[PDB]
Amino acid sequence: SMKLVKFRKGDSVGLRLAGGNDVGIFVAGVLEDSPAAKEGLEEGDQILRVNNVDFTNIIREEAVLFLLDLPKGEEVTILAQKKKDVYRRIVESDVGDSFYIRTHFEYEKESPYGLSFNKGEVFRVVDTLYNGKLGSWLAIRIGKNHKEVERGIIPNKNRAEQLASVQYTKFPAYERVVLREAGFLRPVTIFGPIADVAREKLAREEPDIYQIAKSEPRDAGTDQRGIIRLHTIKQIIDQDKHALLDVTPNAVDRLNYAQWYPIVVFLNPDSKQGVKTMRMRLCPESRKSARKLYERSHKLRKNNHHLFTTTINLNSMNDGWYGALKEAIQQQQNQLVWVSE
């Protein structure tokens, strides 16, 4: 049975909140005498709606700030319901919040209970008011095989967006993500010292599935080696074919932002000599230095590994990498992708 209470606010609404978006916001306690205590509200009640706002799927931090932000002297209306069956079992288990975020900045733990991260890591956030205060989020790291590897504290979004500003992407510090299946053929970026051979090879031998996207003209005073437009890519997606892209790491990030999440394959070199041996076998004409090509891929892995979707280790002695690339691409295509909510 529902309760609908109506009262004026004085200094505070006079409530302590538990739960979160995965279970509901529950009344953890009432300050005595208060107009909210007067109108019936008590421990164990789920807050369903406040004023004109739905509280059934709001994160705990957001609910606290909303009740804080309410003007004193003015009228508050609350839909609630006694659900002691569930509030009691919000105490046995941690359960409160549950949603996923992607990090778009580097953070180093400020405590041994903290969690460090690089760009692109994903987290299940389980508590938006660690220790009943604002400042930290309790969260679980998600990496390989989508498994919960580690649990610990991180900054709340407010501090995060602020910690991230000391790096001036179009991305927010924390973005809300969720798992989806690609309803289209994902563009394919290939990095490493065999990428150019791989792009040409895939397009040449398997033109039915793959297509190279044409580069725009070269910008004056660059390196003498052009960006690709969203229109050029979209038009290739428009005919159930994988767009092969020769683009920079940042273009990949802009592509991630425009929700086109390309399959990003890094072909990891064997050695300097192994690169030459593969060069001699696959493109004996090419004038590109095996030295530079090897240093480029290490520098690129050094600074942009977060953008890698998959990795294939090159064995100079064979061209098994090709067959492995074909399979890696189709594998990635059928994978769930963490997508902006």
């Binding site: 505070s12 006079g14 302590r16 909140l17 953890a28 705990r60 009740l67 409160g96 009943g132 649990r151």
Partner: peptide, 10 residues
């Protein structure tokens, strides 16, 4: 370890 703990008084 890691109990939820009620919010402050709002």
């Amino acid at each position: 370890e890691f109990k939820q703990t009620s919010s402050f008084l709002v």
